[PDB]
Amino acid sequence: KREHWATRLGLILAMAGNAVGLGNFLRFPVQAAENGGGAFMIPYIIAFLLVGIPLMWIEWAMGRYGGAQGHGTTPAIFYLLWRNRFAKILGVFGLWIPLVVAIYYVYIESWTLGFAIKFLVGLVPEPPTDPDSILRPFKEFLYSYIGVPKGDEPILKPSLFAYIVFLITMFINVSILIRGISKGIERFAKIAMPTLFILAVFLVIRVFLLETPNGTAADGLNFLWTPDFEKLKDPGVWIAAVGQIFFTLSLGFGAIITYASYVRKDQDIVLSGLTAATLNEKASVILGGSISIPAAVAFFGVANAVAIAKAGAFNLGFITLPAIFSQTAGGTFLGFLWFFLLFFAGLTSSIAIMQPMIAFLEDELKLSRKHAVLWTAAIVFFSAHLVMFLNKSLDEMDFWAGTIGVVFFGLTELIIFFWIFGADKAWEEINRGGIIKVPRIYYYVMRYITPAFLAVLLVVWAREYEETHWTVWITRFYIIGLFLFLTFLVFLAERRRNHES
Ligand SMILES: CCCCCCCCO[C@@H]1O[C@H](CO)[C@@H](O)[C@H](O)[C@H]1O
Ligand SMILES: CCCCCCCCO[C@@H]1O[C@H](CO)[C@@H](O)[C@H](O)[C@H]1O
Ligand SMILES: CCCCCCCCO[C@@H]1O[C@H](CO)[C@@H](O)[C@H](O)[C@H]1O
Numbered sequence: 001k002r003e004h005w006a007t008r009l010g011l012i013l014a015m016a017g018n019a020v021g022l023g024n025f026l027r028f029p030v031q032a033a034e035n036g037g038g039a040f041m042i043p044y045i046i047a048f049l050l051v052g053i054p055l056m057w058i059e060w061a062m063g064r065y066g067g068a069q070g071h072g073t074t075p076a077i078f079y080l081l082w083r084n085r086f087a088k089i090l091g092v093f094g095l096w097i098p099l100v101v102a103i104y105y106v107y108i109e110s111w112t113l114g115f116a117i118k119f120l121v122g123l124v125p126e127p128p129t130d131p132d133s134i135l136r137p138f139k140e141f142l143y144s145y146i147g148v149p150k151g152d153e154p155i156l157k158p159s160l161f162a163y164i165v166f167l168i169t170m171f172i173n174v175s176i177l178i179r180g181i182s183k184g185i186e187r188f189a190k191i192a193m194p195t196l197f198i199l200a201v202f203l204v205i206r207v208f209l210l211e212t213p214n215g216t217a218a219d220g221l222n223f224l225w226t227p228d229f230e231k232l233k234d235p236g237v238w239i240a241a242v243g244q245i246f247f248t249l250s251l252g253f254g255a256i257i258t259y260a261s262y263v264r265k266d267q268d269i270v271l272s273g274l275t276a277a278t279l280n281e282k283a284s285v286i287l288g289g290s291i292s293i294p295a296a297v298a299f300f301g302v303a304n305a306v307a308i309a310k311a312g313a314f315n316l317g318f319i320t321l322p323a324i325f326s327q328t329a330g331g332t333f334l335g336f337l338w339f340f341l342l343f344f345a346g347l348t349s350s351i352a353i354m355q356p357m358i359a360f361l362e363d364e365l366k367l368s369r370k371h372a373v374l375w376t377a378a379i380v381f382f383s384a385h386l387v388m389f390l391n392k393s394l395d396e397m398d399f400w401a402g403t404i405g406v407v408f409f410g411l412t413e414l415i416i417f418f419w420i421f422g423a424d425k426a427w428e429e430i431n432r433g434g435i436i437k438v439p440r441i442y443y444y445v446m447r448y449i450t451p452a453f454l455a456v457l458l459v460v461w462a463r464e465y466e467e468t469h470w471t472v473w474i475t476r477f478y479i480i481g482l483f484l485f486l487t488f489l490v491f492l493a494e495r496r497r498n499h500e501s
């Protein structure tokens, strides 16, 4: 007795909503520009074929396998694949990663809502040609919303509107998640994914019509899709690319796995998986990449775009792009569409990374969905205060959980499933129910190329990448405590298990 996806389409759209989020529209544009445009597009594609696709199939398999036995989370699932105590411990990262990521992700997701509400109502800055005179009012606007430190103190000071909108955002996440898999996440995916797509396509079209003295949107596209084989030898290009592949595909977050545990034992994962991965890549390389960069390039030429890209993650999407839109007509409504697009793109993703925790409390602590959802909401809402109030706390969570964490966790889930659990049993399991079959070549990729590929990166990472403030220790301290709290629950679960047995 376990919730299941009602419909094939509902399932595919929920898994595409999982993947397609603030990642395709905020991160991808920046990552692609920072690393030389078309330069970044070669390693990004190979990373999709050698890491994204195999890992996407592996996670679906693991999740579906688990769900057939009533287990949607990695501490349970890892233990099934590998009957070892250390399998439960390693499996804890599959609750910790999505949880930590959720803590800052839902906060950023709320900004987009707040901005949308202000653009719609026209409570946005009125810029007075001087590039800085147009950018400044918007930089000031975001800065008041999140409360960027004016002094030396590493202290943020969210506006009350910002803060209340985070309550509303949390409330909307819960109101979906509390309704469950089919009547909440699946009903929501069916509405949001179309809406999202139509919004994107409209903004893409509206952006190609941009032409100024400094360029056109067509300039931005060229920059984006013009090879530069002289970066290929840079580790920093491939790192960025692979890293992007993880975040973007939601790989390593334990989220694909949990969603898959609601797929019926017999249902197909091979085609379904490949479709959701492909929908993601389309959504970023066609939609996400054709908005921010072309628009900045049209207004500032190329050099200045890359300069803005390098500036910050949130500069382009929260300051530059709205500043640009303010300089075209029906621009304020253009910004509304942009933030309303980001909000739906974050909302369908944030409910995905909150579900592993909910699934754990329901599956292992036998909690009711209503309680599992409220308690998880409590933990996320509470811990998020660290992200709202402590400068660079978001950066530190993003680093350990959403950067290092997911890669190490991708490699871990593959070794366990495909080496420890057994490469052939893995392969069999992946293909069972399959409408199509995984191409035979991917058996060797999955077993040798993929884990190798990752192991190499993960080494160059720990080696080539003390120079931080002391407040980083407040965040690290707290997220280590989160890991222990989760280990403790895993402990409590295996015990209730010993007694129910
Ligand atoms: C006899 C059943 C087969 C063994 C696997 C079922 C239990 C999975 O294993 C354990 O279950 C706990 C919940 O019960 C999880 O929270 C633990 O993390 C996991 O250790
Ligand atoms: C459950 C966790 C609560 C811990 C303390 C939270 C205090 C937040 O409180 C609110 O923060 C806002 C944002 O700046 C302010 O605008 C409000 O005036 C303030 O009351
Ligand atoms: C979707 C509804 C959101 C309601 C939140 C409103 C937050 C109130 O915030 C207040 O708004 C005033 C007017 O702008 C300001 O002048 C106040 O200083 C500010 O604290």
Ligand SMILES: CCCCCCCCO[C@@H]1O[C@H](CO)[C@@H](O)[C@H](O)[C@H]1O
Pocket: 365, 366, 367, 492, 493, 495, 496, 500
């Ligand atoms: C060392 C022994 C560990 C005991 C801690 C138990 C964890 C509490 O957990 C509870 O256990 C119950 C019993 O089945 C379940 O019915 C509840 O739903 C569950 O939340």
Ligand SMILES: CCCCCCCCO[C@@H]1O[C@H](CO)[C@@H](O)[C@H](O)[C@H]1O
Pocket: 156, 157, 158, 385, 386, 389, 390
């Ligand atoms: C470790 C994370 C800390 C979260 C607790 C934040 C406590 C906020 O506290 C309140 O915040 C308001 C908004 O800036 C201020 O106006 C109040 O003076 C302040 O007391």
Ligand SMILES: CC(C)C[C@H](N)C(=O)O
Pocket: 018, 019, 020, 021, 022, 023, 024, 101, 105, 247, 248, 249, 250, 251, 253, 349, 350, 352, 353
């Ligand atoms: C944390 C994940 C849900 C992130 C999502 N894959 C995105 O790119 O936004």
Ligand SMILES: [Br-]
Pocket: 023, 024, 028, 244, 248, 284
């Ligand atoms: Br992407």
Ligand SMILES: [Br-]
Pocket: 026, 027, 030, 031, 313
């Ligand atoms: Br970024």
Ligand SMILES: [Br-]
Pocket: 144, 145, 159, 161, 162
């Ligand atoms: Br504000």
Ligand SMILES: [Br-]
Pocket: 153, 154
């Ligand atoms: Br200080």
Ligand SMILES: [Br-]
Pocket: 329, 330, 331, 332, 333
């Ligand atoms: Br307008």
Ligand SMILES: [Br-]
Pocket: 366, 367, 368, 371
């Ligand atoms: Br309960």
Ligand code: NA
Pocket: 016, 017, 018, 019, 020, 021, 022, 344, 345, 346, 347, 348, 349, 350
């Ligand atoms: Na999404």
Ligand code: NA
Pocket: 019, 020, 021, 022, 023, 024, 247, 248, 249, 250, 280
């Ligand atoms: Na994505």
